[PDB]
Amino acid sequence: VNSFSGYLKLTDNVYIKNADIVEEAKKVKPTVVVNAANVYLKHGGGVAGALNKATNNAMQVESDDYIATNGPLKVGGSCVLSGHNLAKHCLHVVGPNVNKGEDIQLLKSAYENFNQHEVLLAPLLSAGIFGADPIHSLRVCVDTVRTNVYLAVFDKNLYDKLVSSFL
Numbered sequence: 001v002n003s004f005s006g007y008l009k010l011t012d013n014v015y016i017k018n019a020d021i022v023e024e025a026k027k028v029k030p031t032v033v034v035n036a037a038n039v040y041l042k043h044g045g046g047v048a049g050a051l052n053k054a055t056n057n058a059m060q061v062e063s064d065d066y067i068a069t070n071g072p073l074k075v076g077g078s079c080v081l082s083g084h085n086l087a088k089h090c091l092h093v094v095g096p097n098v099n100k101g102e103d104i105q106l107l108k109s110a111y112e113n114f115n116q117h118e119v120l121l122a123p124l125l126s127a128g129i130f131g132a133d134p135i136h137s138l139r140v141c142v143d144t145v146r147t148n149v150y151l152a153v154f155d156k157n158l159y160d161k162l163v164s165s166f167l
């Protein structure tokens, strides 16, 4: 039993809710919140900009030190950093950005990072400003992630389309 509330169950291990991931993180304090990161951990907009804003820029400060030490992530890769006031940990995962021409097949590799964590609160990778089809992203999530994932979808209209079209 966990504290996630109001989710629709899609499969054995995948759950979905129309929610603001920032507000959901603030209420649940999950062990892991996933950020929709880029390779530079520059949290300017989308989910990343919202999560970072909610940490009063502490996420960005920590991220800049991470990059200065380690260099950029790989597309499809991830790193574990602090969850600050939102979660114990933040798993920064880099899905391909279609608006940069990155290979959508890397989306499966990106979701594989979730399997290193038993339970996660997450957005749909490569959705939103990353330019992928969120319905495709949901399909790859369900077919790749085996651990327990709670998907927060900000847009109510999109949430309804994802549920209604789910196979």
Ligand SMILES: Cc1noc(-c2ccnc(-c3ccnc4[nH]ccc34)c2)n1
Pocket (backbone or CB within 6 Å): 019, 020, 021, 022, 036, 045, 046, 047, 048, 050, 123, 124, 126, 127, 128, 129, 130, 152, 153, 154, 155
């Ligand atoms: C601009 C832009 N382009 O894409 C997106 C996107 C993609 C996936 N999930 C989200 C999302 C999901 C749940 N809560 C959220 N709070 C703030 C963002 C967010 C946003 N934003």
